[PDB]
Amino acid sequence: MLTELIASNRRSAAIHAFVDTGLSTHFKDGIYVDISELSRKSGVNYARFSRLCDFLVEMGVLVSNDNKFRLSDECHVFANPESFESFMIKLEICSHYSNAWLMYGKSLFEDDGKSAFEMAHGRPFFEYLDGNKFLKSNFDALMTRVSNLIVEKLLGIYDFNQHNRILDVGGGEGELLVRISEKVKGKHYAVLDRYSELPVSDNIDFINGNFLNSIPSGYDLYILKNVLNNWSDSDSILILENFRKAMDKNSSLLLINMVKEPEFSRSFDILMDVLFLGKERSFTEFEYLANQAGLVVQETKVIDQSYSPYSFIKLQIK
Amino acid sequence: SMLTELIASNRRSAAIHAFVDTGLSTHFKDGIYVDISELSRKSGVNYARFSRLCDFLVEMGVLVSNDNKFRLSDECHVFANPESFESFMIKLEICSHYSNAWLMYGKSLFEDDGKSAFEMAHGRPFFEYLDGNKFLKSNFDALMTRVSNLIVEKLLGIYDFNQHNRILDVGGGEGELLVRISEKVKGKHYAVLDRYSELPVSDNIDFINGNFLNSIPSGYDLYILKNVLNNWSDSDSILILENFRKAMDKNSSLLLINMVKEPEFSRSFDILMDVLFLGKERSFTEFEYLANQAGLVVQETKVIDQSYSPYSFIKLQIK
Numbered sequence: 001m002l003t004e005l006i007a008s009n010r011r012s013a014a015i016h017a018f019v020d021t022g023l024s025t026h027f028k029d030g031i032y033v034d035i036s037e038l039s040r041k042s043g044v045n046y047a048r049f050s051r052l053c054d055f056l057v058e059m060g061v062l063v064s065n066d067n068k069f070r071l072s073d074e075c076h077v078f079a080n081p082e083s084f085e086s087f088m089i090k091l092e093i094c095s096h097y098s099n100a101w102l103m104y105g106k107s108l109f110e111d112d113g114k115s116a117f118e119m120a121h122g123r124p125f126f127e128y129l130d131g132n133k134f135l136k137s138n139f140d141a142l143m144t145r146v147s148n149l150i151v152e153k154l155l156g157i158y159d160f161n162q163h164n165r166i167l168d169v170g171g172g173e174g175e176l177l178v179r180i181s182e183k184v185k186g187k188h189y190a191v192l193d194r195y196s197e198l199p200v201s202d203n204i205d206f207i208n209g210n211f212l213n214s215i216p217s218g219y220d221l222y223i224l225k226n227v228l229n230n231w232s233d234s235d236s237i238l239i240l241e242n243f244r245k246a247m248d249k250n251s252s253l254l255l256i257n258m259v260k261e262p263e264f265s266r267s268f269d270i271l272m273d274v275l276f277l278g279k280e281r282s283f284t285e286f287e288y289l290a291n292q293a294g295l296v297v298q299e300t301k302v303i304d305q306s307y308s309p310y311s312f313i314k315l316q317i318k
Numbered sequence: 319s320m321l322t323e324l325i326a327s328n329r330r331s332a333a334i335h336a337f338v339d340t341g342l343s344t345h346f347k348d349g350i351y352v353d354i355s356e357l358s359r360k361s362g363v364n365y366a367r368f369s370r371l372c373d374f375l376v377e378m379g380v381l382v383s384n385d386n387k388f389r390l391s392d393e394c395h396v397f398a399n400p401e402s403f404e405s406f407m408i409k410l411e412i413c414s415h416y417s418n419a420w421l422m423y424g425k426s427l428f429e430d431d432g433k434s435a436f437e438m439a440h441g442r443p444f445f446e447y448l449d450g451n452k453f454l455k456s457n458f459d460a461l462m463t464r465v466s467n468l469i470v471e472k473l474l475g476i477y478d479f480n481q482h483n484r485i486l487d488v489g490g491g492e493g494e495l496l497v498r499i500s501e502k503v504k505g506k507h508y509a510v511l512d513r514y515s516e517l518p519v520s521d522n523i524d525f526i527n528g529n530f531l532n533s534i535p536s537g538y539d540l541y542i543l544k545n546v547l548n549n550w551s552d553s554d555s556i557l558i559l560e561n562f563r564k565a566m567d568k569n570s571s572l573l574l575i576n577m578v579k580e581p582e583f584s585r586s587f588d589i590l591m592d593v594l595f596l597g598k599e600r601s602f603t604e605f606e607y608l609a610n611q612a613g614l615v616v617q618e619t620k621v622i623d624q625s626y627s628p629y630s631f632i633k634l635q636i637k
């Protein structure tokens with residue numbers, strides 16, 4: 001078993017070959033595929049692609065019957081190139097992620113606050129993405145897709161209608177607030193991120209800002225989704241301090257994050273270390289940082305997403 | 319979820335790599351419990367960040383956690399020894415050259431030029447490329463030396479090497495298999511053929527710089543071909559075995575020894591052979607077919623059980 005654990009990478013690489021080529025897009029709506037006919041149609045090598053299909057059956061990605069193959073129920077997402085899972089495998093084993101992982105070991109002996117990613121590429125993750133269209137488009141697309149998947153549940157567990165002026169900080173392409181604004185109308189909607197060129201969307205104010213320097217005041221609802229996992233404890237407190245300075249007594253901050261729970265994998269925690277010198281935090285750790293910034297936890301809920309549990313934390317100023 | 323953690327399979331390999339390649343794992347010898355605060359003080363590794371990696375290694379079953387200390391699992395004792403095959407395996411498994419080969423795998427399936435994904439990434443076939451890369455050649459040859467050393471006792475146990483006079487190991491690399499056999503089976507002539515820019519030296523071994531695609535030398539009564547055919551197409555595999563038939567007389571024997579594909583075990587190795595070589599992991603049946611096409615007869619077959627994989631042992635003579 002230990003040699004196949006060492007060879008874990010091979011599972012990721014096999015899925016990449018199947019999905020990144022678009023071969024998986026021939027397996028829509030649970031159809032059984034004749035690999036002989038797929039080979040003639042697409043010009044993929046029959047015998048060598050048949051061998052990859054056998055390894056995908058072993059992995060449980062494909063199901064074998066009547067001398068054909070279908071995607072498993074869970075793996076229907078691989079037939080859709082717009083699926084978050086399609087964008088995830090495109091990034092997971094890309095050359096930039098690989099080269100960052102190869103600096104991980106060395107990064108554990110350095111104290112200069114440089115991520116494994118920065119050691120490999122010469123700039124921190126988001127600064128590097130500014131000059132790399134492959135990384136930025138695919139990463140921003142992944143975040144747009146997971147945002148889209150949480151909007152319904154989020155609207156369900158919190159009354160957005162009470163609020164007037166809403167700012168999503170580090171909101172990226174602004175998918176979260178665009179989808180919220182279609183359901184909760186007649187509000188003011190703003191999205192802050194790092195924009196070389198401002199996005200444009202009906203009734204969205206896009207702001208080019210820096211949440212390490214300042215959060216703009218005069219909003220009664222702030223959102224910070226999947227940002228703190230990219231930052232040290234020190235940088236996290238600084239971001240939360242900037243919220244406290246921007247917020248008055250009536251303001252609310254919705255802190256929304258993939259949350260660390262003992263039953264689930266630590267693999268994401270380690271990726272945040274490699275890419276950002278960040279971490280996946282528990283409810284307790286998030287509460288500690290918030291208290292250090294002079295904020296108080298007024299509500300906590302868990303949102304069950306398919307891939308991971310999510311922490312919903314409503315914060316107000318002390 | 320299960321699907322997102324399968325997509326993230328690479329993270330397991332990378333975590334093991336960071337733990338072993340740094341030599342951190344060499345602090346966990348003899349199943350001792352390590353205090354990560356002490357290890358940090360001694361080695362200068364970040365306590366908090368290394369403690370998180372240890373928790374992932376516990377999840378994987380590489381480490382065992384008791385009273386805020388960590389030991390290697392019984393199975394993973396090998397990670398504390400930098401001479402172990404497993405140490406060399408993880409240093410190659412996610413190295414930049416293997417990674418870049420894997421990123422060409424999908425594209426390689428639409429080409430019919432007989433270029434491996436490795437050659438598409440690097441501009442030369444695997445072994446030709448290793449001639450100009452000491453990192454890959456030294457670590458690959460070291461891995462092969464370690465797995466050769468692990469099979470020698472079982473091999474001597476299942477075959478009578480003492481009946482033979484002149485022994486050639488073809489593609490024998492650093493010559494570890496014949497060096498270890500020669501310490502237990504004395505008074506013989508021992509030769510090792512491979513691609514040598516400079517000939518290795520070892521008491522009573524004749525190292526030959528050769529090419530088994532062009533010719534194999536006649537005048538030996540025992541020939542060995544271990545873990546070579548998995549690096550070659552069916553066509554090139556047949557050519558290698560024909561070259562043996564042309565080298566052999568009716569009294570010659572060839573021992574064809576290979577990791578063998580059985581349905582109970584993972585297809586992951588078969589796919590690696592495609593990526594690196596346009597090779598494949600073959601069944602007993604497939605090996606016997608290639609041998610028949612080359613004009614060789616199966617005298618004997620056995621299975622050798624190694625910890626990680628089954629091995630095919632096939633004795634061949636000419637028709």
Ligand SMILES: Nc1ncnc2c1ncn2[C@@H]1O[C@H](CSCC[C@H](N)C(=O)O)[C@@H](O)[C@H]1O
Nearest residue numbers: 126143147170171172193194210211225226
């Ligand atoms: N200093 C900074 N100021 C503002 N935004 C920043 C920033 N550093 C990083 N970001 C942004 O932080 C985001 C992290 S990814 C999270 C995106 C979005 N909140 C979602 O959950 O889907 C990226 O969009 C990145 O561009």
Ligand SMILES: Nc1ncnc2c1ncn2[C@@H]1O[C@H](CSCC[C@H](N)C(=O)O)[C@@H](O)[C@H]1O
Nearest residue numbers: 462466489490491512513528529530544545
């Ligand atoms: N054309 C060629 N002629 C001879 N040896 C070759 C060759 N092409 C590759 N090789 C050798 O084939 C070997 C494959 S790895 C097997 C090594 C050894 N027999 C063992 O089992 O441990 C390598 O040592 C490589 O250098």
Ligand SMILES: COc1cc(O)cc2c1C(=O)c1c(O)cccc1C2=O
Nearest residue numbers: 088146226227229230258275307322
């Ligand atoms: C670098 O990857 C991420 C960074 C984030 O800030 C947030 C997420 C990710 C992910 O990779 C990710 C993922 O692969 C699957 C589901 C969710 C996420 C993130 O939220």
Ligand SMILES: COc1cc(O)cc2c1C(=O)c1c(O)cccc1C2=O
Nearest residue numbers: 003407465545546548549577594626
């Ligand atoms: C390129 O990898 C190999 C080529 C071979 O001819 C034989 C082996 C290998 C391996 O990679 C390998 C491994 O990773 C772990 C255990 C055994 C082997 C090979 O025998």
Ligand code: NA
Nearest residue numbers: 021022023042
């Ligand atoms: Na296609």
Ligand code: NA
Nearest residue numbers: 088091092142
């Ligand atoms: Na990612």
Ligand code: NA
Nearest residue numbers: 446447449450
């Ligand atoms: Na050469």
Ligand code: NA
Nearest residue numbers: 490493495496
């Ligand atoms: Na040898």
